[PDB]
A paper describes a structure:
In order to achieve the proof‐of‐concept objectives, we chose a 24‐mer human H‐chain ferritin (HuHF) nanocage as starting materials; subsequently its original Asp residues nearby the C3 symmetry axes were mutated into Phe, and the resulting mutant is referred to as 3FF. One ferritin molecule consists of six C2 rotation axes, four C3 rotation axes, and three C4 rotation axes. Here, by a combination of the multiple, symmetric interaction sites on the outer surface of protein nanocages and the tunable features of phenylalanine‐phenylalanine interactions, a protein engineering approach is reported to construct a variety of superstructures with shape anisotropy, including 3D cubic, 2D hexagonal layered, and 1D rod‐like crystalline protein nanocage arrays by using one single protein building block.
3FF molecules present as the cubic‐like shape from a point view of the C4 axis and are packed with neighboring 3FF monomers at the C3 corners, showing a molecular patterning of body‐centered lattices. Interestingly, after 1 h incubation, 3FF ferritin monomers (2.0 µm) self‐assemble into cubic‐like crystalline arrays having different numbers of faces with dozens of micrometers in size in the buffer (20 mm Tris‐HCl, pH 7.5, 200 mm of NaCl). The X‐ray crystal structure shows that 3FF molecules assemble into body‐centered tetragonal (bct) lattice, being consistent with our design. Further analyses revealed that the C3 axes of adjacent ferritin molecules are parallel offset and the distance between two nearby C3 axes is 9.5 Å. Among three designed Phe‐Phe pairs, two of them at each C3 vertex are involved in the aforementioned π−π interactions between two adjacent ferritin molecules (Figure 2d, we defined an interacting aromatic pair as one for which the distance between phenyl ring centroids (Rcen) is less than 7 Å and/or the shortest inter‐residue carbon‐carbon distance is less than 4.8 Å according to previous reports), and these two types of π−π interactions are shown in Figure 2d, right panel. The conformation of each π−π interaction is distinguished by the center‐normal angle (θ) and the normal‐normal angle (γ).[ 27d ] The F123Ab–F123Bb pair takes an offset stacked conformation, while the second pair F123Ac–F123Bc shows a T‐shaped conformation. Differently, the third Phe–Phe pair (F123Aa–F123Ba) are largely mismatched, causing C3 axes parallel misaligned with equidistance, resulting in the generation of bct lattices rather than body‐centered cubic (bcc) analogs. Taken together, all these findings demonstrate that 3D crystalline protein nanocage arrays with a bct structure originate from the designed intermolecular π−π interaction and exhibit high selectivity for Phe–Phe pairs rather than its analogs.
Author numbering:
A (entry chain B), B (entry chain A), C (entry chain C), D (entry chain C): 5 to 176
Write the structure that this text describes.
Amino acid sequence: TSQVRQNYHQDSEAAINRQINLELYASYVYLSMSYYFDRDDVALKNFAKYFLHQSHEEREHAEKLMKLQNQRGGRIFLQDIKKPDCDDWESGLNAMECALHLEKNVNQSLLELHKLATFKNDPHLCDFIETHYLNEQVKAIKELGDHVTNLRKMGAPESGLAEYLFDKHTLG
Amino acid sequence: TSQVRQNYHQDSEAAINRQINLELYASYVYLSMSYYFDRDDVALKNFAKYFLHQSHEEREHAEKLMKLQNQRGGRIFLQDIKKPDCDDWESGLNAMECALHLEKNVNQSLLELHKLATFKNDPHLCDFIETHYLNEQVKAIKELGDHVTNLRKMGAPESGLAEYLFDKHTLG
Amino acid sequence: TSQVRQNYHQDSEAAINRQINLELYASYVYLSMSYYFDRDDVALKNFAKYFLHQSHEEREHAEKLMKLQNQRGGRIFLQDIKKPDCDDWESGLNAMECALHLEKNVNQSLLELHKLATFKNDPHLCDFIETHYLNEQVKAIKELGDHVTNLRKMGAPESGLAEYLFDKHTLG
Amino acid sequence: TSQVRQNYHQDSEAAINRQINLELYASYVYLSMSYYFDRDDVALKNFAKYFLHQSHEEREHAEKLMKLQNQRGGRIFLQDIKKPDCDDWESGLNAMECALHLEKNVNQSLLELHKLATFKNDPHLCDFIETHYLNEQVKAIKELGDHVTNLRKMGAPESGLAEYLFDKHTLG
Ligand SMILES: [Fe+3]
Ligand SMILES: [Fe+3]
Ligand SMILES: [Fe+3]
Ligand SMILES: [Fe+3]
Ligand SMILES: [Fe+3]
Ligand SMILES: [Fe+3]
Ligand SMILES: [Fe+3]
Ligand SMILES: [Fe+3]
Ligand SMILES: [Fe+3]
């Protein structure tokens, strides 16, 4: 037992480890999506910067959970990081949509995790989730919903002009 | 009676009080429109900022009349600020059309306030309107006209691409 | 149903919309209170500047709730903004006492909007309330508590001298 | 007849010349009032600085009318500047009440000089009055109204303490 540990239940330790892997997973989805738009037959340079920025942000989230695990006396346990479901992401509107489906599963995971932290009476783990992850997911999800909408209204994906002008008037 | 009152007819005092409610009403409409474009199925961020600017200007027109009422020795008498007509504004073109209708209705009320003040041989009240309101209405009305014309000519509302480009390139 | 809505109960949607009305009503009371100390027969410049600031900060309180509704996928429905209880607030001490009542009123709504968010297991909404409204009302209520206490111990409202000196020294 | 005179009635010529006298008389009252608070047995430094400013701004009010007469082709005819009603204005509150009377007096003349310019269809003279004298008197009369109200609610003139504190805090 760790000398710094206090009020940190074993089940939150495991649920922090699991959230670490999901956050790494998401960073790797975003990496995958980013270099898809770097492709010379997709070629939406700001879609690329976007998802690459998100990718780095998501690994930033994973490192913040690993720091916390150590602050609370928990022990990190890492697992394989599954390859993304896709190798090709089809179009910009399509890519925005999987990102939105992705942040809503990261969100469901945090929400279930905050729920556990409430049952196990850990207010420090609860504020940690609240400050650094909860509004962040709410913002992310609102952002991606805005993008999907403008893309649909412009004419994407059957219009390449739509994804071209969006690629630069919104993500530039 | 007020120690400062002078050539300030009670009809004026009442019409100023009504004008204050009209400006507050307008401000409330513009607030409702502003946040209609904030929402995730609309996502026209500069329409939302345009109208939030108009909401704050109208609120500031109201407060100016309240200063004047107290300036001339009248007494402020606030009414309920009634709920705007629409909760959903359909589109950017349509929001712009309602805004035109509104500033033109505010102008007509503002013009009636002026006919009154002439009838009452109140010259200070006349110059107050001339300086701080009449040209404002003429300018506001002209601007929304321009905006209507351009939106129709770009193919709105049936073009989703028109409102989006109009958002980037006229309101940003 | 909205593409960003996740874990955002119908009940909470309605409660926010209501808190929006309330924050708008409070901005109006303060507006009404503000221009009463501008009267030539009351003449408290700093009391007036005080409530105009409070009024404007209550408007921002409402716009922030309007933003949140759209972030969470909820749907703004506005309401008549009913006129404030008074058109004549008697004295600076009476006016401050009304605000103390008014702010404890809004505290009430928020605490119940929070219990409701506890009931519906919405931690994001909860910390949103925790971070942006709760300590503000605790501060706002303590600020007015101090003001009311000072005016009483000075001789207000019988001493008009008390209110003149408060106006320059605590609000200048 | 003057080479620049155009649409400038004999009647208006005479009315301006009269308003010139009046503005000069008001500068003299204020002058007289000013050096009464300099007395070693009254001793209100800021009351004194107050009326000396008002006196000087009334002189500029007269010189501006002198300028206008020559712009319009009219012909200045000056008059005795009669001595002010008092040589002893009793107290700061009484002095402020006299100014409120005096400024409502000049408001009177201007409003009638304006009706006259309406009667003679002289829009230039009208807007000249609108722009440079009307809102100044509305401001001047509201300023003194506030001052009178504050001194009364403080205890003036019975409390010499009231007038000492007004002198530093509203006029310093
Ligand atoms: Fe992200
Ligand atoms: Fe994340
Ligand atoms: Fe307006
Ligand atoms: Fe406007
Ligand atoms: Fe407040
Ligand atoms: Fe509030
Ligand atoms: Fe003092
Ligand atoms: Fe003056
Ligand atoms: Fe003058």
